[PDB]
Design a protein around this ligand. Structure first.
Ligand SMILES: [As]
Ligand SMILES: [As]
Lengths: 193, 194
């Protein structure tokens, strides 16, 4: 249906959603605000990034092939959101004093995703099952912003590296990620990354 | 053995709602006590985190709306329940004595959106979303029950929420579970505060 995304003028908790829409060849309108995002799909109004991701998962079939996979998609997404919460708290609340210890902790925070990949067709497909889910887009965005926070952080992790390279190369997603609409938006809204 | 196992602390906490849901749906499960959680097993599937569990049971027991639109509305209601639950948890463990007066004065404004939801859905006479029970109902019921303990009479400002609690609490299987030692003899939280 007709989509509208309302958010602050940053990537933030909106980036994964946008990546998903772009890659899935959906059209949407952006409305700027100077819990979000607010999302409109016909007469339906949604708030909160994870609730929006799940909705798009159901409607566009990005939620696993069955009930069991759906639950696994949720658990992976929970793990993405736990790290993202720690990121947001670092960025907006303790960047200076906190960063050194955050980056120290970071390889331990990434390993579980590497292991998860290692248990799903040799890490050659997606984070859950044989087809992309909303968890993949969210995990990709998380990995990308961590590479800015800590360049080289995926170097020790070959499945996660190939995974980012592979998903980033899907042609609609690639075009989106190279575009100014993505590249020229700040990651967060306080100058920090 | 039961196909379900719940693994948690000896508290109600984040497990209360799913236990109520399982009891109300006439399901059998095993409790394992531990001195990420709760952990939930359903056959060889292992889940963590109360909301992911609730959603799993919503999908399998048909408690996730009648269609995709309702499913998303269930999720939003659930988000609301979890936001207030997160503030409650903050109060309980972090600032109970100095914070309680403030939290209770703010409580009306936190509760009002749920009352409004009910008033927009068949005059508050069925469930929080649609005409069938969902996992958000169980989660909201628990949040309301524990706020009645924190702030007795807090629902006197909310006629629809009051009747809703009375109505859901009277569902036979759930009623028996809520009166049972299994529920009554666990404390609401882990730090003695409520
Ligand atoms: As956090
Ligand atoms: As909170």
């Amino acid at each position: 249906p007709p989509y509208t995304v309302v958010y602050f003028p940053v990537r933030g908790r909106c980036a994964a959603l946008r990546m998903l829409l772009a890659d899935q060849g959906q059209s949407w309108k952006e409305e700027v605000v100077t819990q979000l995002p607010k999302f409109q799909d016909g007469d339906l109004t949604l708030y909160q990034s994870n609730t929006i991701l799940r909705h798009l998962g159901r409607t566009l079939g990005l939620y696993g092939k069955d009930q069991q996979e759906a639950a696994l998609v949720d658990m992976v997404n929970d793990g993405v959101e736990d790290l993202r919460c720690k990121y947001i708290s670092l960025i907006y609340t303790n960047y200076e004093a906190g960063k050194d210890d955050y980056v120290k902790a970071l390889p331990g925070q990434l390993k579980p995703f590497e292991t998860l990949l290692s248990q799903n067709q040799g890490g050659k497909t997606f984070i859950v099952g044989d087809q992309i889910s909303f968890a993949d887009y969210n995990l990709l965005d998380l990995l990308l912003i961590h590479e800015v926070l800590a360049p080289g952080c995926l170097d020790a992790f070959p499945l996660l590296s190939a995974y980012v390279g592979r998903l980033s190369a899907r042609p609609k997603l690639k075009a989106f990620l190279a575009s100014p609409e993505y590249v020229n938006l700040p990651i967060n809204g306080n100058g920090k990354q």
